[PDB]
């Protein structure tokens, strides 16, 4: 029969209401202010955490302030281990009332609800990201939020904390906490390298020229949303290339300008005419590492003909010092890729090259470089065939 | 006087919560998960559906699973008819509750609640993208999603279907349900004819320049949102034009490249000088032809002084061989458009057209173009006078 | 302890609610229909409203209609003032219920709604945008939206009336309300100037090429959200400023053309080449100026290092007449801030300047040009710091 949820006659049930504050929240648990961890009123017998309220699939959790300590997590028995904490809910469990409304004597100990230590493995079986209690072909009963990875050392010693960013909506992200911005930088100047193929550097430092025969490493000022991607954990993919945490319909806006341009002089043997040099700036996407996600999560295979090569600026030199660019694309990308962007042309500087034969300043270099990535759309359903291919 | 919904002392009500869930789902109803035709348990006398969840102007809907078949529709009297499954709040009707809610026998024949077949004309007087439960001017006590066209045949045999795809929230929009992508397409090449105005094929396939002497029509990588626009259904149009199915301020994203572009030869006549050619690129809209909207319902009218043409690109070829361009632009479309982008040059090769005399790839053609069009705000209120112009 | 706010045996509250509301309303508050002035129904002793609905910090709040005047507003007292008309919400009152649901007699008097006069500093002081109920360092009781600027002349006279758009939720916003479009425009022409350094005219008057003699100053259609931005209230910023009232990440789309663009002529002294010029578009944010937001409100302050001036197009003219450009970049902006778009380049027309010595449709101009200005992310918690700056 056809069952009526928010009708004159429905009784409007815990997993209703958490399934449409779920829909409010566009199916992302996190923490919605507080719950940081607290140091002062942490030893080597508790961990102490701030007040705060989270998330977790349509359930609102709250850790009450009173008097501090907010809460503590006994972290007895834990010892030279590198563990996760975590927000559980646990719908096995029974929350038990007392008390009355009548008097004003009414609690509940929710028993459903855990601050506990998990190992990465059990986590990500758990995990509100890859499995739901509100699931139609696999439900669960219990799923975790990870907040802090926390690692003790000897007994009788303080525990080293890092907070799980992707875990908390901080800010940037508020009314759309799904969606928006992944990545952006201010604008930066860029030496092309003297090969046919290479990376653009997007993670926040750039070669730039800074004199007529040098160019020196410098730092530009980037943003990352933790929850959307991160910088590559491998140092020799850490300056270009970025690791998607969730699959999507991206959108990739590029600009800037290539400076120094090479082209063929204008002599009498060509007939006073430029000769134009073609170059060519790429996105790209690699799936062939897995586990790059955060955790080491396994990543989410992309459908069968995949892009993996897309053209935002190609055309040839035009004779000007300076030639300015502009692309907006669209492209499809998957938890575990990583994402780059490249610079192509020619080899042969005296034929079909854009760049020169000068360094620094004198070289040919991308300059007021600048770009931003931003998730634009799923691939839930349907949409991961149809739209996931490019 | 001055009344509370949400208050200490209010009464939250069945349309109450109805209405925060609209609100939550951006004004669109649609199927949340499956509602799809169960093909085994059909016959010439009823109709069956899978399990699943809908929401309906804010009232959630659902077909409860149990042992199959999840849901049964009567199809006895229905034949040689093209109809519409249509899923029916009928607020006329009662729902009558049976049991207690003390013991547990509590239920509820939802008599609001029809799967129903209708006509187009019917289903159009109380379809929820063009009538409301919750209107201010004209409210409503009876209204219909479409979810299949049925075709029934002979007395005896099974019906033909077709899934209303634009009533399905299947994925790509899940977050932002009424916005997002509504068309994307991948990098192409498309032959340039000889005219002075064409449209750029945006359906799928292009004219691709295959050798030195022709071109070949070629499949390209599309993606269409149905509830936010679809292919032209007449065949003349079908390669270029997209019919806007929903009002709106959209965003249009273009780029590639025209490569063998045309230039007067610097010769001794011209001071040895490039002799640059005029081109541009345009997007367009036209509401000329009414009915072309899903179900052949009534255009939206624009209001008067709206636009019909505007120019992306302009400018002339720079003698290079191939010369990038972008553009990004927000524009205004009403229910009905006819949408197209075009390109338009001079015809004379020899003085102001950005074309040559070569076919295939020896004559001047885009390469490399892809495009984005998006939802980027609505023109409910006062915003269709002042927006919906340009 | 942990606290369950939606689990099984949880009692969900007013303010919970009111705070789901809330996250569905992307933390804006404002009018969702009706609410205007019935000035028919208004004397020298009283001001009339329409029917109509509003949300106020996830409170829903209801004029009722019955037989007009929907509601009356004492305006008793106030002579020779601007007052602003305020929907309040003040948690201290006690809203008295009477009669009993099992009667049909249940109806409450919301003490803790009302419409009021209050003057602008007053309103600041409780201003939805500023403070909050639900706030967490300092949660308030009472809290405000105004809806109209009332100025009272004389005792006897009916008062003179401007609407607040920014708190109407009137078209263009629903569905994202605290995001989209903050301004946009038609393409348009406009003539440089013969200096270094000048701003584009966004607010829709451009000095238009009319003849190969003259430009002249014509209207063009323009669009702003008076949520997130207005036009500059001082006359002399008033073509070129926009003072943006929200902060965020913006994202700024630009495209057009530079026409008759200068440069030097190929002759046998330089080798028969085209000597370009350079200029540069750039885009503009400035603080030095406090109380340009609506209400003359405290301007919110950038972090530490905040950009001020960013190249959006930088390069040489090519040597053609006309040469199309486009960019896209996101920037950070605060409420009070003033944005504007610069023009740059230098004043030697026969060395290095991109503009000639003619005037009208003859001289250096920007033609087709326009520009979309959108809120594409918060700057709420750590993002001020992280993603402020630039
Ligand atoms: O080209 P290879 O060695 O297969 O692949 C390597 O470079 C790619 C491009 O940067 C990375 O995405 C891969 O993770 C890495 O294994
Ligand atoms: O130019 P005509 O014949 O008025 O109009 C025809 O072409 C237009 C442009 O493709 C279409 O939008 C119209 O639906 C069609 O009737
Ligand atoms: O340059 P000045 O005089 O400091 O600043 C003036 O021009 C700026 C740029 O248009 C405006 O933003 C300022 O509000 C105004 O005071």
Redesign the pocket.
């Known amino acids: 029969v056809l069952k009526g949820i928010n009708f004159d006659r429905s009784i409007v049930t815990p997993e209703n209401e958490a399934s449409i504050l779920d829909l409010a929240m566009q199916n992302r648990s996190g923490v919605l202010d507080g719950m940081t961890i607290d140091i002062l009123n942490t030893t080597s017998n508790q961990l102490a955490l701030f007040h705060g309220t989270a998330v977790l699939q349509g359930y609102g959790i709250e850790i009450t302030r009173a008097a501090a300590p907010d809460v503590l997590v006994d972290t007895t028995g834990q010892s030279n281990e590198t563990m996760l904490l975590c927000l559980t809910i646990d719908l096995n469990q029974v929350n038990v009332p007392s008390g009355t409304v009548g008097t004003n004597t009414y609690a509940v100990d929710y028993k459903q609800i855990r601050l506990e230590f998990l190992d990465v493995p059990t986590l990500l079986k758990q995990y509100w990201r890859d499995h739901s209690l509100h699931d139609l072909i696999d439900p669960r009963r219990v799923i975790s939020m990870p907040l802090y990875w926390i690692t003790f050392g000897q007994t009788g010693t303080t525990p080293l904390y890092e907070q799980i960013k992707s875990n908390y909506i901080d800010g940037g992200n508020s009314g759309n906490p799904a969606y928006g911005i992944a990545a952006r930088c201010e604008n930066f100047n860029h030496f092309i390298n003297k090969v046919a193929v290479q990376?653009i550097p997007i993670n926040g430092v750039a070669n730039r020229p800074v004199s007529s025969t040098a160019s020196q490493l410098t730092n530009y000022k980037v943003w990352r949303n933790p929850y959307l991607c991160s910088q590559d954990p491998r140092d020799k993919?850490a300056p270009?290339?970025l690791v998607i945490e969730e699959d999507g319909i991206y959108r990739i806006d590029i600009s800037g300008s290539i400076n120094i341009a090479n082209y063929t002089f204008p002599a009498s043997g060509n007939s006073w005419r430029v000769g134009g040099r073609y170059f060519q700036i790429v996105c790209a996407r690699?799936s062939?590492?897995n586990n790059?996600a955060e955790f080491g999560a396994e990543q989410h295979l992309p459908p069968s003909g995949v892009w993996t090569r897309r053209v935002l600026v190609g055309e040839y030199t035009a004779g000007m010092t300076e030639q300015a660019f502009s692309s907006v694309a669209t492209i499809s990308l998957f938890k575990g890729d990583?994402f780059?962007l490249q610079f192509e042309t020619g080899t042969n500087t005296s034929r079909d090259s854009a760049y020169n034969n000068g360094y620094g300043t004198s070289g040919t270099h991308l300059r007021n470089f600048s770009y931003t990535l931003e998730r634009v759309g799923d691939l839930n359903g349907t949409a991961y065939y149809d739209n996931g291919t490019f």
């Open positions: 990376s993919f270009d290339n690699n062939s590492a790059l990583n780059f």
